[PDB]
From a paper:
Structures 3 and 4 are analogous to recent structures of yeast 13S and pre-15S intermediates, respectively. Structures 3 and 4, as well as the human preholo intermediate, also allow comparison to previously determined structures of the corresponding yeast 13S, pre-15S and preholo intermediates, both validating our approach and revealing conserved or species-specific aspects of assembly. In structure 4, only the extreme N terminus (residues 2–8) of the β5 propeptide is visible, at the junction of α6, α7 and [name]. This resembles a harpoon, anchored 60 Å away from the rest of β5.
Dedicated assembly factors orchestrate the stepwise production of many molecular machines, including the 28-subunit proteasome core particle (CP) that mediates protein degradation. Unlike conventional proteases, the proteasome harbors three different types of active site (β1 or caspase-like, β2 or trypsin-like and β5 or chymotrypsin-like), each present twice. Previous work identified five CP chaperones: [name] ([name], also called [name])29–34 and proteasome assembly chaperones 1–4 ([name]–PAC4).
Numbering used by the authors:
A (entry chain D): 1 to 124, 130 to 193
B (entry chain E): 1 to 239
C (entry chain B): 3 to 201, 206 to 248
D (entry chain A): 5 to 233
E (entry chain J): 1 to 166, 177 to 235, 242 to 264
F (entry chain F): 5 to 244
G (entry chain N): 2 to 8
H (entry chain I): 2 to 23, 31 to 107, 119 to 288
The structure:
């Protein structure tokens, strides 16, 4: 009847005695150091809002791009490490241009999210050995109505209606659940 | 207390003759929602229990599509499920393209087992952490299989996996006698009744967390969600 | 300690301890000296292998020739020094084949320093524990003198010293060096004085000089009679200075 | 903490595994090498001293070319792999330049080969040091190579077990102007100084080199030389 | 602080205190379990500090249903007031920056109590041995200079082997053994250290070896070295629960 | 052997590899399988534990077929046994393709044993955890039985028994006249031995699985007919 | 498993 | 733990002896780190802080502690649904795993009944600071302490496989002065408990105060109805008798809470 | 790109200049394939696996690709320690007339380019 | 491999001891005695003889499948001592090397060349961090065209030599002392008698015809041949009488 020390979270390919790959959970926890981003989709468009958190007045404000342009009708958001999201957005843009060149059609938001997520779920030549420390938030319009999606470091995407990623995710989500309505306009 | 040195790797034998990482991976299947599968003389059906993180979200997909006659249900990790689904789709497509003949379910399952056995013996890898239920129809009739993270597969006839699946398994074992001589409506009713045992005795099997997949002789694989499962649910009794 | 096992680990305050130890391993070798004069460059060295049963093959044990215009001296581990010297000769020959002109000294030094730095960044290899001194003549800048470190760092000097007791030699050179007024004879006298202070017999030193004569570089190794005469003259002057 | 890894510098700036390899070298059978005014003599003490041994199976003194010989002191298995590579290098030099290789070039190439195993992880250094003799342009040569890849040029040396006393003995009775027979006698005496037994022609090997080329002495000649001491 | 289990502190004059150290493989703790189980000691108090991780459990030495319901904590004190022998047991791991205060408190209590001498059972890493130690016995010992005037003749007659110095001494993996020895020799307290080179894994035979080594001197059983020691009933599942089905 | 048992390429001070010993200890975590060679054939028999009534009759089979003339019975980890069965099938098929006739059993055993042993040398892989038997029958060779060990050593046997209780099974096998009986009596003897060695308290229930290859099957591996199995079960229960 | 280690 | 081919690695030690033994800047950084991880007791309702230990300023007759989300939910649904409770103070912490967060109430009808609800994680170096801040150094003679905690079923030790047990189930561990009895079997022999409940129980045992600790072993550690309902037999004990009045209201509140739990991750499907 | 490579014609890369170019460029691979096929057909699957494992283990301890290596253990295993071919005496690779940057070649060996 | 290397002066093959001793090689040497048998090889005037022990403890085994005398080539015979799987693997490797030499050079490989090639292969395993040495030793006998009978030996360290009469196993030292005593002071019948007497005197067994196995080569018949039970019994009876 003694007490000892055991370590199960120093490697990516190690299972805890109850499943629970801990490195992926730590990567997910790393998102909380970013800035809050709010996105909700409605019957006539989808909105994205995000804070900048400028560190010094000498910095040029038009250089912290927390909202980017995947294509003519698809947006994106930022939370976490900046360097990784750049190499994910590049993949998104290349895929959405290749699809047009091949088929003369616009990619679905779900399809582009799946294509992006197909890259971030493989780890452990050029592939990294650690999970991506970033969470994205797609959105736009398609042949269906406005659509909003989500993605986390584990590499899996889920459709949604109101999200909140960043430091104040819990409070923002609580307020969103309290305030949101089934069918509003782009002013409320 | 003596397990510290013998459970950090999948290529290490314990002094008792055990590999602990395989058991730890097997412990991960019980982290997902329960799914139920059963078959009859003509049809094979799959029933799953969707779960949403909160109210303002859409329930994730638990029943996937592989071929015109093969469909699966997942429980456990998601990346492993996606990789296995990609492998199965590629194998079926290649076989159809080359031989102009559907890939048999037994050969598919044997290929899955052979692929899954490899990362449990070599360094730098970890076992897959997903358990599968496969339903298909071929020249030998309806089939249903189960897959374990330890690269083991069983040719069962009515099985359920996931968290708190013991009650569903008990109900299926009790009522397996009268499954062969049944048609689709009461087969789906039996499946739903078995799945209802998982929930606490305060909830209900509403039309927002149920997914149904049906395959048959003249019927291809079909998935019903949201309002499509209404015709399969009105006939259920009370708890 | 915890951060002192590989070359690819950063200390919690930004240090590379393996590189520090590689640089510290130099301080056990012999003393190499070099001073730049008005009409030539000089090199001096210490013979650490002086035994009664040791042969006298080859020209010099620590002074090597790289091409028609450059020479070098090493201090550190001989096994790595040999590889470095061979690579230097190969680089110079490659540049000559490419451009039909002799390679500049700074380009040669940079080319070798890149190789020396490459081993301090990829894991699984051991850094080169060798420090070198370069002398030569170039048509762009004239006479030059350089120095290299195990970490891959270099710089141009006018009077430097590496090896055992480097601090005292550097201090004395800084005290007794005159800017832009050192003739070759004065440089030889200063080198003899510094070596005598920091270590005299004429069988324990090796001196080489580089000069330009009628449009062609001449690299010589001083003779035993010449170095003995220099030692005797220095001793006589020091005695007369009492 | 710094003693187990080959690619780690100690805080004092030292490599310890190479020192331990040198210690491994310093625990083998003794060897002696003396160069005279007209040749070089090499000697060593055998390990298989029992009767149950065929005298024409394995030799410690090996020829590399017509004018080059070599002997070792250290680990036996790590010796053949170097002898074969040295022979291949000599043949390559002859094929390219149409002239027998000089001793110094062969020593440099062998040292370069030996140095490679002391810089990367996953290997261990060779545990053997070599003595090389030759004759080029009417001059005798004698060299020695360390496990670390550094070579020296000697006039009279002794390595192996109990070598400091042998070196002092050689320094005591070495003469600049010496014939080959006197060198052989001195080498035999130096080997006898540390033998721990009764020395016989069947447990020592002697090799000589002169203008005629490298040659390994026969047991009859060894006995004849022994009878005069 | 020493807190009596009852209402008053028992008198301890001339007693011999023997204690473990939290070291590699828990060899000292296992040996303490063997000694306490075999000699059938009884609890007399607790040693309450804020230096060890807290833990709780039922009685680890249970022989009947009337005593298998006694709560225990990480630090406990047992005594056998018939052979002048008192023991201490630790069942946890030290928090960082909390070892030297514990050693100071323990030695203060030892000095203020009246114990004759202290014996420490520990262990050391077995992969840091040179060639000369690979050909010898894996048992070592140390003696405080205040004790060497008393039992050194007996120790020499026992043909043991004193541990090599390095002049100082370093114990690679002994935990607080070095600190305890240094503080005891500075404070002029008799002390002896018994250790053995071990490696992680099944460390029961190491415990039996160490207890036999100690019995070779203290002579607490009949001289021999056959079911002499009693294994406590808590040594049930030292490798885990069991095999999941459908795998073998 | 603590400290020297974390890799398959490490030697103990007394000169032994401990990972291989742990692998061979891992095979006694499964049920018991026995095999008896008789005058004119080879008879197999295994004890299978029922996990649930939901599995189909014919799942988790432990008696495989390599080709039309070779049987196989396994014990230990199931996945490793399946991989080894696939390897044996590949070897036999390739030999038949190159040489145009049926492969002798000794060469197949040698090939599979060497393949198993190949995993004992490197630290990048893990030794197998299953042991199995092979059997065949030919008119000009007669019955033949073989054993394979996770260490990679093979031998020829008259009677063999592997699993949890190999000692007792061998004890009752040794008191038999193997060389002067046919398959008809050997099947009953095997059933009796399996029923005797089985333990009731630890294991809830079990079902037999018997098979032979011999002269009366024209050298082909087949499953025992149901009536013979039932009468053998009745005989074993009555004798018990 | 071994053939997968190579490539 | 090998990065390249052939690196020399050392096996880990289960006794935690790897820290070895080993400037004013070092003292400054150590002091800054210590101040960053200091337990502080504050009065949340206005004011700034507190001076004397919490139990050294009030009289007590019963103390109930909840650790984990399930126990906090149980006490919120079943005990706090009736009567009026006034918050006394809260605790401010900081770990690598954290940041009702350690908030203390007491009954207004009976000012000698206290309840605690800690849903945060307290590191092993903050247990004794928590004990000193809450209890103090002059323990009262007449008190009762009940502790509730949830643990995973994989932490249990059994001859059979851990997947065969009929989880959830309860176990108990009580001090020698606890003259009452338990509603569940006591914990078996080769099983131990550590962290904060162990610290509280050890303090109570050492200083001779009646106490009892309840453990729930579950296969799901999130907010689930079955885990919360597994605590029901405690309601029949003498510890919680005049604190539970209405069951259906508690069930309705529990249903609402189970509807509004939280957002979840996307690893397990 | 377009500066780190140049003077390459696609239509002049599909057609080899000489019949002997491809055979000489890929002699070792074909020899290994033939030996492995014969060994696998004669003895079994284990022998080529062991040989390939030994080759892979030996080939993994060398100098960085911008310095010449000796390859002693590989030559001992292959058996080329007592044979001299035309690859040894013609166009010595230890005295190559061209060499690239160190970091670029190390990166190219790993496949990051 | 990504498993690294264990820390210690022993416990790894590429680590030198403070006085340059490799301990894993010595442990591999100790691994030879695990079998528990002894082998003896004696070279005569015009013949060579190999004698080794046989131990079958189980009555359920097939004695025809238990052997330690192998045939590398039609003119070369071998006897192995140590681990069985390692011995068989090394026999297969030797057969492959002999076939390759025959193909490359055009004539049968000599015994010394085969032993040297095996030793050269074995030397590599003691320098890399991936492989481990095999725990067995090999003894080869054969007839040379111009030199006569030849006896050789190899060890896990990579060291090989030619002998006149050697032994291996668990009683190697006593067998060697007996062989020196005999040699210091031989037709075909004398070599077999000498080897059998050496083994019997060392082991104190008084053998029966079913506990030993013999293989011989001669100048008249240079093909490796395994003696049978009748011949072994005849030799034993002649030795007894």
């Amino acid at each position: 009847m003694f007490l000892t020390r055991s370590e199960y979270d120093r490697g990516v390919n190690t299972f805890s005695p109850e499943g629970r790959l801990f490195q992926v959970e730590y990567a997910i926890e790393a998102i909380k150091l970013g800035s809050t981003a709010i996105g909700i989709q409605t019957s006539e468009g989808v909105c994205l809002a995000v804070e900048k958190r400028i560190t010094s007045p000498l910095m040029e404000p038009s250089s912290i791009e927390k909202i980017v342009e995947i294509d003519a009708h698809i947006g994106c958001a930022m939370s976490g490490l900046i360097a990784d999201a750049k190499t994910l957005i590049d993949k998104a843009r290349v895929e959405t241009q290749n699809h047009w060149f091949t088929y003369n059609e616009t990619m679905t938001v779900e399809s582009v999210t799946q294509a992006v997520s197909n890259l971030a779920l493989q780890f452990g030549p050029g592939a990294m050995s650690r999970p991506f420390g970033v969470a994205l938030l797609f959105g736009g319009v398609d042949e269906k109505g406005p659509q909003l999606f989500h993605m986390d470091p584990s590499g899996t995407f889920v459709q949604c209606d109101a999200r909140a990623i960043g430091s104040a995710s819990e409070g923002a989500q609580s307020s969103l659940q309290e305030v949101y309505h089934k069918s509003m306009t782009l002013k409320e | 207390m003596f397990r510290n040195q013998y459970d950090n790797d999948v290529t290490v034998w314990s002094p008792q003759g055990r590999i602990h990482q395989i058991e730890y991976a097997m412990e991960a299947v019980k982290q997902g929602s329960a799914t139920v599968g059963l078959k009859s003389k003509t049809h094979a059906v799959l029933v799953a229990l969707k779960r949403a993180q909160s109210e303002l979200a859409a329930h994730q997909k638990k029943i996937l599509h592989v071929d015109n006659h093969i469909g699966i249900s997942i429980a456990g990790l998601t990346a492993d499920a996606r990789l296995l689904c990609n492998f199965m789709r590629q194998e079926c497509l290649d076989s159809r393209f080359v031989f102009d003949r559907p890939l048999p379910v037994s050969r598919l399952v044997s290929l899955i087992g052979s692929k899954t056995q490899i990362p449990t013996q070599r360094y730098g890898r970890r076992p897959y952490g997903v358990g599968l239920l496969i339903a298909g129809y071929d020249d030998m009739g309806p089939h249903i299989f189960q897959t374990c993270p330890s690269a083991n597969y069983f040719d069962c006839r009515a099985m359920s996996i996931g968290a708190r699946s013991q009650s569903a398994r008990t109900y299926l074992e009790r009522h397996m006698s009268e499954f062969m001589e049944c048609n689709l409506n009461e087969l789906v009713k039996h499946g739903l009744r078995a799945l209802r045992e998982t929930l606490p005795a305060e909830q209900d099997l509403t039309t927002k967390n149920v997914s149904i997949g049906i395959v048959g002789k003249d019927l291809e694989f079909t998935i019903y969600d949201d309002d499509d499962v209404s015709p399969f649910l009105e006939g259920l009794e009370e708890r | 300690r915890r951060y002192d096992s590989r070359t690819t680990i950063f200390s919690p305050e930004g240090r590379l301890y393996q590189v520090e130890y590689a640089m510290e391993a130099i301080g056990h070798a012999g003393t190499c000296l070099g001073i730049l004069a008005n009409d030539g460059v000089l090199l001096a060295a210490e013979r650490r292998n002086i035994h009664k049963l040791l042969d006298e093959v080859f020209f010099s044990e620590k002074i090597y020739k790289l091409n028609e215009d450059m020479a070098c001296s090493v201090a550190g581990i001989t096994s790595d020094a040999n590889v470095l010297t061979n690579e230097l000769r190969l680089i110079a020959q490659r540049y000559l084949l490419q451009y039909q002109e002799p390679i500049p000294c700074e380009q040669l030094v940079t080319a070798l320093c890149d190789i020396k730095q490459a081993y301090t960044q990829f894991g699984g290899k051991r850094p080169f524990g060798v420090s070198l001194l370069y002398i030569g003549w170039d048509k762009h800048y004239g006479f030059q003198l350089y120095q290299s470190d195990p970490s891959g760092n270099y710089g141009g000097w006018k009077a430097t010293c590496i090896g055992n007791n480097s601090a005292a030699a550097v201090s004395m050179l800084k005290q007794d060096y005159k800017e832009g007024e050192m003739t070759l004879k004065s440089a030889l006298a200063l080198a003899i004085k510094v070596l005598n202070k920091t270590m005299l017999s004429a069988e324990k030193v090796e001196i080489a000089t580089l000069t330009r004569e009628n449009g062609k570089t001449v690299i010589r190794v001083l003779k035993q009679k010449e170095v003995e005469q220099l030692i005797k003259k220095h001793e006589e002057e020091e005695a007369k200075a009492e | 903490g710094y003693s187990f890894s080959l690619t780690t510098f100690s805080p004092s700036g030292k490599l310890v595994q190479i020192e331990y390899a040198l210690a491994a070298v310093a625990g083998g059978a003794p060897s002696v090498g003396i160069k005279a005014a007209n040749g070089v003599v090499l000697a060593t003490e055998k390990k298989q001293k029992s009767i149950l041994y065929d005298e024409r199976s394995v030799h410690k003194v090996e020829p590399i070319t017509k004018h080059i010989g070599l002997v070792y002191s250290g680990m036996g298995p790590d010796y053949r792999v170097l002898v074969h590579r040295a022979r291949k290098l000599a043949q390559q030099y002859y094929l390219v330049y149409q002239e027998p290789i000089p001793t110094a070039q062969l020593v440099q190439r062998v040292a370069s080969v030996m140095q490679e195993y002391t810089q990367s992880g996953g290997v261990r250094p060779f545990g053997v040091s070599l003595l090389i003799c030759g004759w080029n342009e009417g001059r005798p040569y004698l060299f020695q190579s360390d496990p670390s890849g550094a070579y020296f040029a000697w006039k009279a040396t002794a390595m192996g077990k109990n070598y400091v006393n042998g070196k002092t003995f050689l320094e005591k009775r070495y003469n600049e102007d010496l014939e080959l027979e006197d060198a052989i006698h001195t080498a035999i005496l130096t080997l006898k100084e540390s033998f721990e037994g009764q020395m016989t022609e069947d447990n020592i090997e002697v090799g000589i080199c002169n203008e005629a080329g490298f040659r390994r002495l026969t047991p009859t000649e060894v006995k004849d030389y022994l009878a005069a001491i | 602080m020493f807190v009596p289990c009852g209402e008053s502190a028992p008198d301890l004059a001339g007693f011999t205190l023997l204690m473990p150290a939290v070291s590699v493989g828990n060899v000292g703790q296992l040996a303490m379990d063997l000694i306490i189980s075999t000699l059938n000691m009884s609890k007399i108090g607790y040693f309450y500090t804020d230096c060890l991780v807290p833990m709780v459990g039922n009685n680890p030495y249970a022989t009947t249903e009337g005593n298998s319901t006694e709560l225990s904590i990480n630090a406990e004190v047992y005594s056998l007031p018939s052979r002048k022998l008192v023991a201490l047991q630790l069942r946890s791991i030290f928090i960082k920056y909390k070892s030297k205060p514990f050693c100071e408190k323990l030695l203060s209590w030892v000095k203020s109590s009246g114990c004759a001498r202290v014996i420490v059972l520990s262990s050391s890493h077995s992969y840091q041995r040179n060639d000369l130690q690979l050909r010898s016995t894996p048992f070592r010992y140390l003696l405080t200079p205040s004790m060497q005037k008393s039992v050194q003749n007996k120790i020499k007659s026992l043909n043991w082997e004193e541990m090599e110095k390095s002049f100082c001494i370093r114990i690679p993996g002994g935990g607080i053994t070095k600190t305890l020895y240094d503080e005891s020799c500075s404070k002029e307290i008799q002390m002896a250290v018994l250790l053995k080179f071990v490696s992680e894994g099944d460390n029961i035979p190491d415990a039996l070896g160490l207890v036999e080594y100690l019995n070779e001197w203290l002579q607490i059983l009949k001289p021999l070295s056959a079911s002499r020691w009693k294994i406590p009933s808590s040594w049930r599942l030292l490798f885990g629960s069991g095999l999941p089905p459908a795998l073998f | 052997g603590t400290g020297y048992d974390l890799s398959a390429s490490t030697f103990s001070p007394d000169g032994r590899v401990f990972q291989v010993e742990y692998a061979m200890k891992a095979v006694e975590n499964s049920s018991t399988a026995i095999g008896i060679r008789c005058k004119d054939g080879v008879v197999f028999g295994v004890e299978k534990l029922v996990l649930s009534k939901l599995y189909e009759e014919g799942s988790n089979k432990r008696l495989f077929n390599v080709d039309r003339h070779v049987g196989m019975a396994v014990a230990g980890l199931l996945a490793d046994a399946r991989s080894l069965a696939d390897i044996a099938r590949e070897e036999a098929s390739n030999f038949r393709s190159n040489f145009g006739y049926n492969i002798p059993l000794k060469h197949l055993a040698d090939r599979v044993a060497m393949y198993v042993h190949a995993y004992t040398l490197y630290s990048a892989v893990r030794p197998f955890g299953c042991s199995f038997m092979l059997g065949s029958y030919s008119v000009n060779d007669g019955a033949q039985l073989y054993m394979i060990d996770p260490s990679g050593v093979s031998y020829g046997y008259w009677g063999c028994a592997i699993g949890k209780a190999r000692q007792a099974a061998k004890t009752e096998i040794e008191k038999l006249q193997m060389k002067e009986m046919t398959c008809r009596d050997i099947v009953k003897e095997v059933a009796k031995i399996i029923y005797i060695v089985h333990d009731e308290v630890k294991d809830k229930a079990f079902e037999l699985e018997l098979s032979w290859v011999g002269e009366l099957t024209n050298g082909r591996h087949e499953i025992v007919p149901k009536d013979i199995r039932e009468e053998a079960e009745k005989y074993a229960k009555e004798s018990l | 498993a071994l053939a997968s280690v190579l490539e | 733990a090998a990065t390249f081919f052939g690196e020399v690695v050392k096996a880990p030690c289960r006794a935690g002896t790897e820290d070895e033994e080993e400037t004013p800047e070092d003292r400054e950084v150590r002091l800054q780190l210590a101040r960053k991880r200091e337990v502080r007791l504050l009065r949340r309702q206005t004011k700034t802080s507190l001076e004397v230990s919490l139990l050294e300023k009030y009289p007590c007759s019963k103390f109930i502690i909840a650790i984990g989300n399930n126990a906090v939910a149980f006490l919120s649904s079943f005990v706090m649904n009736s009567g009026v409770w006034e918050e006394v103070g809260c605790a401010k912490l900081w770990n690598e795993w954290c940041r009702a967060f350690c908030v203390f109430y007491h009954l207004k009808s009976n000012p000698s009944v206290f309840l605690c609800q800690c849903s945060c994680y307290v590191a092993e170096d903050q247990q004794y600071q928590w004990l000193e801040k809450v209890f103090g150094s002059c323990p009262r003679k007449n008190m009762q302490i009940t502790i509730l905690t949830c643990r995973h079923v994989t932490d249990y030790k059994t001859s059979e496989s851990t997947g065969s047990l009929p989880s959830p189930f309860l176990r108990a561990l009580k001090t020698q002065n606890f003259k009452d009895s338990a509603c569940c079997p006591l914990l078996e022999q080769p099983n131990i408990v550590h962290d904060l409940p162990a610290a509280v129980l050890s303090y109570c045992q050492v200083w001779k105060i009646p106490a009892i600790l309840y453990l729930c072993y579950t296969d799901v550690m999130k907010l689930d109805l079955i885990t919360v309902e597994a605590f029901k037999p405690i309601l029949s004990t003498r510890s919680l008798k005049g604190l539970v009045k209405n069951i259906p209201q508690s069930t309705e509140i529990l249903k609402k809470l189970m509807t509004t739990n939280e957002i979840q991750s996307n690893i397990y499907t | 790109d377009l500066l780190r490579k140049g003077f390459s014609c696609v239509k002049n890369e599909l057609l080899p200049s000489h019949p002997l170019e491809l055979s000489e460029k890929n002699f070792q691979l074909n020899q290994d394939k033939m030996n492995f096929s014969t060994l696998r057909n004669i003895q079994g699957l284990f022998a080529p696996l062991k040989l390939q494992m030994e080759f892979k283990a030996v080939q993994q301890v060398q100098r960085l690709p911008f310095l010449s290596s000796s390859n002693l253990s590989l030559d001992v295993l292959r058996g080329n320690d007592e044979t001299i071919g035309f690859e040894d005496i013609l166009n010595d690779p230890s005295q190559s007339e061209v060499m690239g940057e160190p970091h670029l070649m190390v990166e190219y060996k790993l496949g990051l380019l | 491999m990504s498993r690294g290397s264990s820390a210690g002066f022993d416990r790894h093959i590429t680590i030198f001891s403070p006085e340059g001793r490799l301990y894993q090689v010595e442990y591999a040497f100790k691994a030879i005695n695990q079998g528990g048998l002894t082998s003896v090889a004696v070279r005569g005037k015009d013949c060579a003889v190999i004698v080794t022990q046989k131990k079958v403890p189980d009555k359920l085994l097939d004695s025809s499948t238990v052997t330690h005398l192998f045939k590398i080539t039609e003119n070369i015979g071998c006897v192995m001592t140590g681990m069985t799987a390692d011995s068989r693997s090394q026999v297969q490797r030797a057969r492959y090397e002999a076939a390759n030499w025959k193909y490359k050079y055009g004539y049968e490989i000599p015994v010394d060349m085969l032993c040297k090639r095996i030793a050269d292969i074995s030397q590599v395993y003691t320098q890399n961090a991936e492989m481990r040495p095999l725990g067995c030793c090999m003894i080869l006998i054969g007839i040379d065209e111009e030199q006569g009978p030849q006896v050789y030996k190899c060890d896990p360290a990579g060291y090989y030599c030619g002998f006149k009469a050697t032994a291996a196993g668990v009683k190697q030292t006593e067998s060697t002392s007996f062989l020196e005593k005999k040699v210091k002071k031989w037709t075909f019948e004398q070599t077999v008698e000498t080897a059998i007497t050496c083994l019997s005197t060392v082991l104190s067994i008084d053998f029966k015809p079913s506990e030993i196995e013999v293989g011989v080569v001669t100048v008249e018949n240079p093909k490796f041949r395994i003696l049978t039970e009748a011949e072994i019994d005849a030799h034993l009876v002649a030795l007894a009488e």
